[PDB]
Structure formats: C-alpha cells, structure tokens
Amino acid sequence: NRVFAKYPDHIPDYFKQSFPKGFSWERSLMFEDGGVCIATNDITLKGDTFFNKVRFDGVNFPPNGPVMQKKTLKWEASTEKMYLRDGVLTGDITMALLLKGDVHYRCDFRTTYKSRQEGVKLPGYHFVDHCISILRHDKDYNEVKLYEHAVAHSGL
Amino acid sequence: NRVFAKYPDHIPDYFKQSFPKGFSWERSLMFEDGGVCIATNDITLKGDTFFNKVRFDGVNFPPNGPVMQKKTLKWEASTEKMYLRDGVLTGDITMALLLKGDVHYRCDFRTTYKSRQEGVKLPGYHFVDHCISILRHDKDYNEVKLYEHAVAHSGL
Amino acid sequence: NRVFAKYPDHIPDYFKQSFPKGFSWERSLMFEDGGVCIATNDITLKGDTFFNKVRFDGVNFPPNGPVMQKKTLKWEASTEKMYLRDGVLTGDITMALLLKGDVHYRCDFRTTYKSRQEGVKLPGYHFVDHCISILRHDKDYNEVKLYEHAVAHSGL
Amino acid sequence: NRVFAKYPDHIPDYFKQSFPKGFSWERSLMFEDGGVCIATNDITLKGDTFFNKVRFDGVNFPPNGPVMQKKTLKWEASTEKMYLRDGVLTGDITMALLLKGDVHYRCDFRTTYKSRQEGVKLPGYHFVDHCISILRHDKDYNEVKLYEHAVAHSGL
Amino acid sequence: PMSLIKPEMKIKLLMEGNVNGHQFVIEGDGKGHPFEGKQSMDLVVKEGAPLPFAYDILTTAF
Amino acid sequence: PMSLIKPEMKIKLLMEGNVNGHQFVIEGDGKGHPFEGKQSMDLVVKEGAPLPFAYDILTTAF
Amino acid sequence: PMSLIKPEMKIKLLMEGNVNGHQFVIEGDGKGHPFEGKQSMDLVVKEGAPLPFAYDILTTAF
Amino acid sequence: PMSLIKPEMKIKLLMEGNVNGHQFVIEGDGKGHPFEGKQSMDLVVKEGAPLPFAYDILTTAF
Numbered sequence: 001n002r003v004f005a006k007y008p009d010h011i012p013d014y015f016k017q018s019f020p021k022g023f024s025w026e027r028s029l030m031f032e033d034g035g036v037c038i039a040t041n042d043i044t045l046k047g048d049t050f051f052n053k054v055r056f057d058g059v060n061f062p063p064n065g066p067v068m069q070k071k072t073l074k075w076e077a078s079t080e081k082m083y084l085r086d087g088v089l090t091g092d093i094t095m096a097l098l099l100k101g102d103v104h105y106r107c108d109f110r111t112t113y114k115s116r117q118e119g120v121k122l123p124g125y126h127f128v129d130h131c132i133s134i135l136r137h138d139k140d141y142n143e144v145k146l147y148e149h150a151v152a153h154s155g156l
Numbered sequence: 157n158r159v160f161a162k163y164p165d166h167i168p169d170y171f172k173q174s175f176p177k178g179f180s181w182e183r184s185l186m187f188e189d190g191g192v193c194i195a196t197n198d199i200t201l202k203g204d205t206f207f208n209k210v211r212f213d214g215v216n217f218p219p220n221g222p223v224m225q226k227k228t229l230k231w232e233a234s235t236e237k238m239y240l241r242d243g244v245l246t247g248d249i250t251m252a253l254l255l256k257g258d259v260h261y262r263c264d265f266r267t268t269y270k271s272r273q274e275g276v277k278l279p280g281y282h283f284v285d286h287c288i289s290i291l292r293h294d295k296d297y298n299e300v301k302l303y304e305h306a307v308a309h310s311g312l
Numbered sequence: 313n314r315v316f317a318k319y320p321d322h323i324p325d326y327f328k329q330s331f332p333k334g335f336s337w338e339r340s341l342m343f344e345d346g347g348v349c350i351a352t353n354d355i356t357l358k359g360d361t362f363f364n365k366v367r368f369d370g371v372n373f374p375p376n377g378p379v380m381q382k383k384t385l386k387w388e389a390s391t392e393k394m395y396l397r398d399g400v401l402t403g404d405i406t407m408a409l410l411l412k413g414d415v416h417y418r419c420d421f422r423t424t425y426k427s428r429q430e431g432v433k434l435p436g437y438h439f440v441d442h443c444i445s446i447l448r449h450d451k452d453y454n455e456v457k458l459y460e461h462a463v464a465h466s467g468l
Numbered sequence: 469n470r471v472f473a474k475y476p477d478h479i480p481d482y483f484k485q486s487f488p489k490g491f492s493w494e495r496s497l498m499f500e501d502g503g504v505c506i507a508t509n510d511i512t513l514k515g516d517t518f519f520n521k522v523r524f525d526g527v528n529f530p531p532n533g534p535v536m537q538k539k540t541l542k543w544e545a546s547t548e549k550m551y552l553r554d555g556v557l558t559g560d561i562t563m564a565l566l567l568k569g570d571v572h573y574r575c576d577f578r579t580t581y582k583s584r585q586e587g588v589k590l591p592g593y594h595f596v597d598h599c600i601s602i603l604r605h606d607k608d609y610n611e612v613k614l615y616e617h618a619v620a621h622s623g624l
Numbered sequence: 625p626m627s628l629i630k631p632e633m634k635i636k637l638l639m640e641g642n643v644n645g646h647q648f649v650i651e652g653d654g655k656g657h658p659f660e661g662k663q664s665m666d667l668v669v670k671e672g673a674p675l676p677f678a679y680d681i682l683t684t685a686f
Numbered sequence: 687p688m689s690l691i692k693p694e695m696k697i698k699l700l701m702e703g704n705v706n707g708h709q710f711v712i713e714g715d716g717k718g719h720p721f722e723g724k725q726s727m728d729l730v731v732k733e734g735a736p737l738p739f740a741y742d743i744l745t746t747a748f
Numbered sequence: 749p750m751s752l753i754k755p756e757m758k759i760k761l762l763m764e765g766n767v768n769g770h771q772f773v774i775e776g777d778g779k780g781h782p783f784e785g786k787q788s789m790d791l792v793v794k795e796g797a798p799l800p801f802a803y804d805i806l807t808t809a810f
Numbered sequence: 811p812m813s814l815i816k817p818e819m820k821i822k823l824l825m826e827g828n829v830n831g832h833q834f835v836i837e838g839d840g841k842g843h844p845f846e847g848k849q850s851m852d853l854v855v856k857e858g859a860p861l862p863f864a865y866d867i868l869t870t871a872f
C-alpha cells in the first residue's frame with residue numbers, strides 16, 4: 001500500500017489522492033530461476049481503516065530452489081522507479097532476496113496502480129525508496145510481525 | 157492437457173502414464189509488452205472423462221494494447237521444448253499471437269508438469285508441435301468452439 | 313547462414329533470394345544465468361563461395377558457470393520461429409545446451425536478417441528446424457569439425 | 469567509470485581501491501523492444517589520467533523504433549543495485565529513456581566489474597544513485613558535452 | 625504405468641479467472657483422441673460476459 | 687483530491703494465495719503513519735499452515 | 749530474385765571475438781548443400797588458443 | 811589498497827562501436843572529481859558521422 005510512503009510536496013501523491021474511493025494494484029514478480037508470482041490488492045477505506053483484499057499466486061519455483069527450501073533471509077532495501085506506461089502509473093524494481101550462504105537471489109517487480117478516484121493528478125517520473133522487514137516471527141512463520149519504511153524522491 | 161498429444165514409442169509419455177491419479181500443471185505467460193499471466197490446471201479422471209480445475213490470472217496489460225483492445229486473430233502454430241528442470245518436466249515455448257494489421261505479438265511460455273502417479277518414466281529432451289485454433293465463436297466470444305492438434309517428436 | 317536450410321516451395325526463401333548482393337544478420341544470445349552474447353555476420357558471395365565476416369562478443373558469464381568452466385556437451389536440436397518485426401525478418405528460438413550431469417542450460421535467441429538484394433519476397437510466419445553438432449574436435453577445441461542440418465516448414 | 473562516484477566511509481569502494489593496476493567492466497543493455505547492446509571498458513591509469521578503451525555493440529533495434537529514429541531525450545536518473553554474483557561485483561539497474569511525446573522506453577542494465585588490483589576489499593549489497601546528462605551538443609551530435617553525478621549509499 | 629487411456633475420451637472443465645481486474649468463469653465440455661493428439665471443446669462464459677480482453681490469451685489453458 | 691488521510695491509520699487485510707500448489711490464507715491487522723511512510727502489521731496464517739515456502743516472497747503484497 | 753545458388757557451395761569464414769575479456773580469432777573453411785539444408789566446416793583457432801570457455805556458445809555464429 | 815587517486819583527475823577515452831550495422835569511432839577528453847562523484851567529458855565522432863541512432867544509448871559507456 002503505497003499510501004504508506006513519504007511523498008515530498010513537489011511530487012504528486014497518486015495514492016493519498018485516491019480516496020475515499022480507493023485504488024488497486026497488480027504486480028508481477030519474476031524470479032531469476034523461473035519462479036513467477038502475480039499479486040493483486042484492492043484497497044478500500046472505511047473510517048480510518050484501510051481494507052486490503054489480496055490474492056497471491058506463484059508457480060514454476062524449482063523444488064530445491066531457495067524459495068521452496070526456505071533459504072531466504074530478507075529482501076534488501078530497494079528503489080522503485082515510478083512512471084506512466086500507456087497512461088497507467090507503473091513501478092519497476094530491481095529486487096533482491098539475501099539468501100543463507102551470503103548470496104543474492106534476484107527478482108524483477110512491475111506493479112501497476114489504478115485509482116478509482118476521479119481527477120487524480122498524475123506524477124512524473126520519480127522514485128520510491130523501500131525497506132521491508134520481518135521484525136519477528138514464530139518458528140513456522142504462522143505469526144509474523146512485518147514493517148515497511150518508504151520515501152519518495154526525485155533522485156539526483 | 158498434454159494427454160492430447162501424439163507421442164511416438166521412443167519418447168516416454170509422461171501424461172498418458174499419469175493415470176488414474178492424474179497430474180497438474182502450472183504456466184507463466186510473459187507477453188512482450190508487460191502483460192503477465194499465470195494459469196494452473198489440476199487434471200483428474202473419472203470414467204472416461206478428464207476433469208479440469210483451471211485458474212487464470214493476468215495483470216499489467218496496457219489498456220490500449222492488443223489484448224485489452226481485442227486485436228488478436230490467433231496463436232501461430234508452435235513447437236514446445238520439453239526438458240527436466242530440477243527434476244520437474246518443463247515445457248518452454250516461443251509463442252506468437254497474430255494481430256490485426258498483419259503483425260505479431262510475442263509471448264514466452266513456461267509450463268511445469270507434475271504427475272501424481274507413482275513410478276512414471278521421465279522423458280529426455282524432446283519437442284511437441286502444437287496448433288490451437290478457435291474454430292468458431294459468437295460475436296462476444298461467450299460461446300467458443302476450440303480445437304488443438306499436438307504431436308511429440310525428437311526434432312532433427 | 314540460413315542459406316543452408318531446406319525451404320519448401322510454398323515458403324519464400326529470404327536467403328537464397330538474397331544474392332548476388334548477399335545479406336547480414338545480427339543475433340542476441342541471452343543465457344539464463346546472465347551471460348549475454350551478440351553475434352553478427354556479413355555474408356557475401358564470390359564465385360561459388362560464401363564469405364563470412366563474423367564478430368562475437370560475450371559478457372557477464374559467471375566465472376564458475378557452465379560456460380566459463382566448459383561444462384557444455386551440445387546444443388539440443390531446435391525450432392526457430394520466423395516472422396517479421398517492424399518489417400525485418402526475425403527468428404526467435406528457445407535454445408538449450410545439454411550440460412555434464414544430465415541437466416540443461418537455457419538460452420534465448422533473437423536473430424534479425426537483412427538482405428541487400430532488391431525485390432526480395434518476404435515470407436510469412438514459419439519455422440526452421442535445426443540441429444547443429446560438433447562432429448569432432450581436438451583436446452582444447454583448437455580444431456573443430458562442425459555440422460548443421462536445417463529444414464523450414466509450416467508447422468502443424 | 470564508477471571511480472567517479474561518491475562513496476561513504478562505511479561502504480568499501482571497489483573502484484578507488486582498483487589502482488594503480490586498474491579495472492574493467494562489461495555491460496549488457498536489454499531494451500524493452502528487443503534492442504540489445506554490449507559495452508566493455510578497460511580502464512587504466514597513467515599519471516593523473518584515466519584511460520578508457522571502450523567497445524560498444526548494438527543489435528536488433530527496430531528500424532522505426534525510438535533508437536534508430538533518434539526520438540530519445542535523456543536517461544532518467546537511476547539507482548544501481550550493487551552486489552556480488554558468483555564472487556563478481558555486479559550492478560543491476562532499472563533504466564529508462566525519456567522519449568519525445570512524454571513517454572518512457574525501458575532498458576535493463578547489468579554491469580560486472582573486475583579489478584586487476586590484488587587485495588581489494590569487496591563491498592556488501594549497496595546502491596549508487598546516478599544522473600547522466602548531455603549538457604550540450606551540436607546538430608548531429610558529432611560534438612557532445614557529457615556529465616555524470618553519482619553517489620553510493622545504503623538505502624533506507 | 626501401462627496406460628488404460630482410451631482412443632476416445634471426454635472432457636469437462638471449469639475455469640475461474642481474473643484479467644486486469646475483470647473476473648470471469650468459463651465452463652467447457654469437450655472430447656478428444658489422445659493417441660491422435662487432437663481435442664475439441666465447447667466453451668461458455670458463465671460469469672463476466674462479455675469479456676473485455678482477447679479470448680486468445682486463455683485458450684491454451686483449457 | 688485534497689487528501690483527508692490522517693497521520694495515523696489502521697489496516698485490515700486478507701490474503702488468499704497458492705504457491706506451487708500450496709493453498710493458504712493469511713489475515714493481517716496493522717497500522718501506520720502515511721505521511722512518515724511507515725507501517726507495521728501482525729500477520730497470521732489461517733489456512734495452509736505451515737507454509738512450505740519462503741514467507742519473504744509474500745511480504746510486499748501485504 | 750531467381751536464385752542461381754548451386755546444389756554445392758563452398759564457405760570461407762573469419763570470426764573475431766571476445767568472451768569475458770578473452771580475445772580470439774577463428775578461421776573456417778567449409779562447404780554445403782543449400783537445397784538439402786546441410787553444411788559442414790573445419791574451424792581453427794588462430795589467436796587466443798586455448799579458449800577458456802565453452803566452444804558451443806560460438807557454433808551457431810559460424 | 812590505500813587509494814592515491816586525487817580530488818581532480820583527467821580522462822582520455824576511445825570508443826569503437828557498431829550499432830545495427832553502423833560502424834563508428836568516438837574520442838573523449840574529460841576530467842572529474844572522484845570524491846565528489848562528478849565527471850564531464852568532451853566527445854567527438856571521428857568515424858561514422860553522422861550517427862543514425864540515438865546518442866543516448868552510448869552515454870553510460872563513456
């Protein structure tokens with residue numbers, strides 16, 4: 001939910017403008033070993049609570065790969081490149097999972113964002129730095145405490 | 157359903173061997189303009205009828221692209237390259253949709269096949285020629301007559 | 313040199329039509345582990361001899377990967393998909409190198425062909441089966457005997 | 469030449485450590501419309517001057533595409549993700565060219581850096597913000613004034 | 625396994641999908657000749673009609 | 687639009703997914719500071735526990 | 749064009765390349781049957797011997 | 811290594827290239843401030859002028 005990203009005044013905030021009607025996003029996650037995931041989220045607002053209807057599908061992960069063998073440690077911080085593609089706000093990211101053994105596993109992200117709010121002002125090409133982290137979790141990850149910090153900027 | 161493919165005697169038929177327990181497959185469809193789809197099918201058998209539980213999800217298609225604008229005419233015939241990836245039968249294909257205006261729109265396919273039948277003999281690297289066609293359909297495609305012809309071979 | 317491909321009468325032969333002036337081709341080879349190669353060839357004709365001016369550049373191959381460690385055994389046979397991209401004859405191929413240990417290493421090919429002969433009749437979407445093989449070689453491959461068999465067809 | 473990048477004290481500077489022997493780099497540029505380029509540079513040092521032996525090859529660009537039709541305006545600023553791949557320092561980047569008509573044209577970069585200096589301390593996963601610009605040029609770009617600003621950081 | 629699949633088989637199918645936000649359901653009833661490598665099917669959109677995207681992207685999934 | 691989003695907001699989430707054939711459902715309850723660009727959430731696997739794949743692949747989808 | 753290419757043709761080739769920093773030159777002398785879609789060639793490394801990478805990556809470029 | 815690179819450095823460059831069949835040579839003369847992460851260069855096309863493609867594709871290679 002990119003609503004949770006610090007946007008400076010000089011960059012139109014597509015997400016905070018998308019209410020009360022809300023917005024949705026679609027994302028493709030292309031892993032370097034063939035794994036492919038599609039995630040979608042329809043975000044709505046009621047009172048002061050954002051509701052998220054998420055779907056996540058993943059296929060073609062090698063059975064002995066780092067994903068199916070649970071060898072990932074965390075996502076490294078990243079910088080999302082935001083721009084318009086055929087009129088749709090899009091974010092492309094060079095993502096990387098740190099694995100056990102001190103090596104990285106790359107994944108390419110492409111997220112498309114679509115607001116349901118009328119008259120939203122579209123931003124120009126910009127960036128959003130991210131850092132997502134699992135603060136703590138139980139043995140099997142049945143219970144997870146997640147956290148994200150994101151800041152939009154103009155690079156340079 | 158690759159069960160419907162003519163397999164020569166010298167190439168193990170992973171699919172016809174996968175019964176009565178059945179098999180499932182996962183597929184990623186990566187279109188050249190950013191569109192990404194994931195399709196899955198769990199195939200079972202009861203009597204002389206194959207049952208298919210299919211899920212299809214597609215995202216990131218440009219709104220004015222050939223897919224969302226319904227400008228496709230057909231898939232060209234193709235040749236699927238079958239091989240094992242980390243012990244899993246995989247089929248990679250260079251696919252192409254013919255569009256109005258006599259131009260092509262490429263899509264890369266990767267399908268992974270997983271049998272539930274024990275003792276299945278795995279094939280070596282081989283090929284499966286395909287030709288899928290919509291024989292007829294009503295105006296909005298609410299009703300479609302589909303057909304496919306597939307033949308496995310060793311190339312050369 | 314696609315001139316050495318058996319073309320049936322119903323498919324225009326872009327290559328055998330490209331003389332006496334000749335033609336050239338450019339190719340990108342994208343390997344699954346990051347290796348990227350670019351090859352080009354300018355083909356001319358003198359008497360009954362085809363002359364080839366070839367350039368080959370490769371980068372980003374992992375030092376311990378199958379290419380730099382010489383762990384490849386052969387290219388599997390393949391089927392090239394031929395079509396026009398922005399008016400230029402293009403061939404896309406799902407290629408795979410068989411490696412020691414009985415596993416495959418994928419590479420995606422895209423070749424563009426440009427004739428210098430005027431009035432060449434362009435072919436429609438079609439295929440070209442290939443089989444390239446090193447018939448024999450000395451210890452370090454300083455001397456290699458190469459062979460290729462190729463046949464164009466309309467699929468099915 | 470990543471030597472020209474502001475590195476903070478907490479991130480090992482692979483490039484400024486690479487002298488007097490120097491270093492080289494290889495890069496693949498994969499454009500969204502099929503264009504593929506390979507660039508290499510061998511950087512040496514003599515006195516207070518860095519010498520660069522550069523090779524650049526590009527193929528498969530659509531004849532009517534933005535590159536062959538000279539419709540690009542500039543590269544947007546970027547953030548390179550630096551990490552080790554099989555022991556080799558690698559930089560992956562989500563690059564984008566702004567085109568006339570206010571639209572973007574994406575290109576994925578992968579650069580591998582190899583120092584010739586012994587005992588170089590390798591950095592961990594990090595980032596390098598970039599901004600390259602053509603300050604001025606003559607009509608046909610026979611004469612170009614180029615400039616780049618780069619800053620390494622740890623994200624957040 | 626020694627396949628008992630017959631020269632003539634029937635096919636039943638149910639596809640649930642979502643493309644660019646458009647939800648739909650398609651049912652299929654077909655048949656085929658496994659050893660000939662040929663099959664055909666009658667497909668009907670049960671939910672989400674009319675589809676706002678190219679039907680072709682779905683066909684190899686049936 | 688002139689955003690009325692507050693400095694403090696709550697979050698409710700429901701994820702339905704399937705990875706390499708493994709079906710699961712995860713519920714989330716969190717909160718965040720929109721203008722600070724920070725958020726946190728408590729996630730619980732309601733169906734499909736224990737997950738047979740790296741939880742990390744799911745995190746940016748919450 | 750009405751092709752005058754003969755059933756038997758000869759081939760001369762010169763490849764200049766560089767892989768992962770290794771420079772090399774390979775000369776080729778061959779022949780083929782255009783209408784049968786077959787060709788063969790004798791390749792010799794003139795510079796850069798011995799090659800430190802898989803020769804197979806080069807073969808389709810001859 | 812303990813870098814002896816100075817706050818001010820000079821740059822000499824020679825690029826030989828070929829894009830979509832067009833051969834060219836570009837010479838560069840520049841300078842920069844390594845520790846400020848800034849550099850500039852004067853580039854001149856010595857062969858292949860005028861270039862028939864977007865100069866921008868070449869810039870990060872200098």
Ligand code: NI
Binds near residue numbers: 137
């Ligand atoms: Ni932990």
Ligand code: NI
Binds near residue numbers: 293
């Ligand atoms: Ni029709």
Ligand code: NI
Binds near residue numbers: 449
């Ligand atoms: Ni041998």
Ligand code: NI
Binds near residue numbers: 605
């Ligand atoms: Ni200008």
Ligand code: NI
Binds near residue numbers: 625626
């Ligand atoms: Ni048996």
Ligand code: NI
Binds near residue numbers: 688
């Ligand atoms: Ni307003």
Ligand code: NI
Binds near residue numbers: 749750
């Ligand atoms: Ni004629």
Ligand code: NI
Binds near residue numbers: 811812
């Ligand atoms: Ni030291």
